[PDB]
Amino acid sequence: WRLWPSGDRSQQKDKQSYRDLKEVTPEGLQMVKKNFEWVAERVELLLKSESQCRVVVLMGSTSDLGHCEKIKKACGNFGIPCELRVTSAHKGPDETLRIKAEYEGDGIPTVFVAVAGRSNGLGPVMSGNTAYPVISCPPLTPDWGVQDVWSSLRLPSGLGCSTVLSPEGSAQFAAQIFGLSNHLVWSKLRASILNTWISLKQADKKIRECNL
Amino acid sequence: WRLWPSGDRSQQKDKQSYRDLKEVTPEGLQMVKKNFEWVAERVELLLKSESQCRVVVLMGSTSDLGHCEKIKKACGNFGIPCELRVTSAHKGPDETLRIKAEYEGDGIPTVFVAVAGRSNGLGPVMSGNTAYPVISCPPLTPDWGVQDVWSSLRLPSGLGCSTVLSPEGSAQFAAQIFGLSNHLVWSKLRASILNTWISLKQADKKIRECNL
Ligand SMILES: Nc1c(C(=O)O)ncn1[C@@H]1O[C@H](COP(=O)(O)O)[C@@H](O)[C@H]1O
Ligand SMILES: Nc1c(C(=O)O)ncn1[C@@H]1O[C@H](COP(=O)(O)O)[C@@H](O)[C@H]1O
C-alpha cells in the first residue's frame, strides 16, 4: 500500500520510501526500516474500538420478547452489545423515564429500539424525552399491522422517532448509526454489502443453468 | 301525583290521604294539611345537585383549541363545569401526570377528555394512570383520520379508554356518566331525547306536505 500520515506524500511510511532512493546506502536502509517500524507500532490499533456502542430494546410486554431476541441476536452480528428491558409508556410512564435516564447517564452512546404492539406510545414518549436516537420496531402481524403502524409514523412536531419494521433491519439501522463513529461496525456493514452481492451473483450463476 | 315515602302506601303524602277519609273531620283535615306541608318542606330540594361533576379536556397542542371549545360549550348545555388544559404525553409526560393528580386529588368526580391528533398517546397514558374515566375525542379530519383513529382504539390490556369522535358527543357521553349520580344532568339528557324526537315529528310533518 501507500500510507501518507496527514495525507502528506513527503511523510510516506510505506515501501515507496525504498523504491524512491536514487542510491541504496546503509543510511537509506535505516530510514526505510524506521518507516516499516512506524507502521508496525500502529497497525495493532486498527483492531481497537475508538467508541462504545449500545442498543437498548424497550418492550411494553414480555409477549413481544421473541421479536426483541431477534433484534438482540442481529446486534451481536455487528459486535454491538444489546440490552432488553420491560417498560410500558401507558401503565408505567414514570418507570419508562427512570430507565431511559439510567442509559442516558452513564456516558455510553445509545440507540433505543421501542417495541410496542397496537398503539405504540413507547417510541413517541421515548423520542420526546431523549436526545439519543429512537427507532420504533413494532411487532406488526397481518391481522392489524396496516392499522397499528400509523401510531409509529404520524407523530406530533418535535419528534425525530424513525420506523423500521424488520427486527434484523432495526439492528442494521442501529449499526449504520454507530458505523459513523466506529470503524469496526462500519467494516462489518461494508463487508456485508459485498457478501450479499456475492450471494446474488452465486444464486444467479446457479439458476442460469436451468436456462440451458 | 301519588308520593310514597320508602315506596310505602300507608305513608302516602299526596291528596289520596284526603280522597280516602271515610268522613272529613277537622282532625282528618289537620293530618291532610301535615302531608301537604311534608311535601312542601322537601320539594325545593329537587332543585339541589346531590353530586359535583367536572369534565377536564386535556389537549396536546393549542392548534386543537377550537375542537376543545366545542366540548366545553356542549358541557355547559348539561350544566357541567369544563376545564381546558394543555399537556403533551410525548413532550411533557411528567407534567401530564402532575395535572392529572391535581384533578384526582381535590375530591370532585371527574371525566377526562383526551384531545390529541395524529398518534394519540395522551388518552392511553391518562387511561393507564387514573381510576376515573377517560374518553379520547381525537380531532380527526378526512386527510389522515382513517389512519389516526386506530391509535385511540387498539390499546394494550388494562386500559379502559373509550373513543367518541363527535366533540358534542364526548360531552354528551360525559353527561350520561354523571347522570348516573346526578338527577339534574340525567333530566337534561331525558328532556333532550324528547325534544329531538319532537323535532323529527315536526320535520316529518313539514316534508309530508310536499307529498300532496
Ligand atoms: N403499545 C404498547 C404500550 C405502550 O405504548 O405503553 N404498552 C404495551 N403496548 C403493546 O400492546 C400489546 C399488548 O400488550 P399487553 O396487553 O400485555 O400490555 C403489546 O404488543 C405491547 O408491546
Ligand atoms: N398526539 C399528540 C400528543 C401526544 O400524544 O402526546 N401531543 C400532541 N399530539 C397531537 O399531534 C398534533 C400535532 O401537534 P403539535 O405538533 O403542535 O404538538 C395535534 O393535533 C396534537 O394534539
Are residues A148 and B150 in contact, defined by beta-carbon separation less than 8 angstroms? yes
Please name the amino acid found at residue B51.
Answer: S
B195: its cell numbers: 325534544
Asked whether the beta carbons of residue B155 and residue A129 sit closer than 8 angstroms, the reply is no
Of B117, B144, B154, the CB nearest to A118: B154
Here the contacts of A96-99 (C-beta below 8 Å, separation 24 or greater) are A96/A58, A96/A122, A96/A125, A96/A126, A96/B93, A97/A125, A97/A129, A97/B93, A97/B94, A99/A58
Q: Which residues touch B73 (CB under 8 Å, ≥6 apart)? A: none
Are residues A59 and A36 in contact, defined by beta-carbon separation less than 8 angstroms? no
Q: Please name the residues between 55 and 94 in chain A that touch chain B, using a CB distance below 8 Å.
A: 60-61, 88-94
Measured in whole angstroms, the distance separating CA B14 from the mean position of its chain's CA atoms is 32
| Alpha helix (H) residue ranges in chain B | 16-19, 26-42, 65-77, 93-104, 122-129, 145-148, 150-153, 167-179, 183-207
Q: For residues B32 and B13, what is the distance between their CA atoms, to the nearest angstrom? A: 8
Task: Give the resolution in Å.
Answer: 2.4
Determination technique for this entry:
X-ray
- Which residue from A177, A179, A68, A52 is spatially nearest to A122, judged by alpha carbons? A68
- Which residue from A6, A38, A35, A40 is spatially nearest to A19, judged by alpha carbons? A35
Tally Cβ neighbours within 10 Å of residue A145.
Answer: 13
A97: its cell numbers: 423515564
Chain B CB contacts of A97 below 8 Å = 93-94
Q: For residues A172 and B195, what is the distance between their CA atoms, to the nearest angstrom? A: 63
Q: Which residues touch B124 (CB under 8 Å, ≥6 apart)? A: A89, A90, A119, A121, B89, B155, B156, B159, B161
Q: For residues B75 and B58, what is the distance between their CA atoms, to the nearest angstrom? A: 14
Are residues A114 and A61 in contact, defined by beta-carbon separation less than 8 angstroms? no
Mutation to probe ligand 1, out of A58, A61, A96, A134 (largest number of atoms < 8 A from CB): A61
- Tell me the CA–centroid distance for residue B161 and ligand 1, in Å: 14
Chain B CB contacts of A147 below 8 Å = 150, 154
How many CB pairs below 8 A link A and B? 109
Measured in whole angstroms, the distance separating CA A41 from the mean position of its chain's CA atoms is 29
Rg of chain B (C-alpha set): 24
Q: For residues B137 and A116, what is the distance between their CA atoms, to the nearest angstrom? A: 23
Are residues B154 and A118 in contact, defined by beta-carbon separation less than 8 angstroms? yes
- Which residue from A114, A113, A109 is spatially nearest to A178, judged by alpha carbons? A109
- Tell me the CA–centroid distance for residue B197 and ligand 1, in Å: 43
**Quick one: which atom of ligand 1 is closest to the CA of A116?**
22
Are residues B58 and B115 in contact, defined by beta-carbon separation less than 8 angstroms? yes
CA angle B111, B113, B117 (to 5 degrees): 170
> Residue A118: exposed, middle, or buried by beta-carbon count in 10 A (0-12, 13-18, 19+)?
buried
- The length of chain B is 212
Q: For residues A12 and A163, what is the distance between their CA atoms, to the nearest angstrom? A: 46
Are residues A171 and A75 in contact, defined by beta-carbon separation less than 8 angstroms? yes
Nearest residue by C-alpha to atom 14 in ligand 1: B156
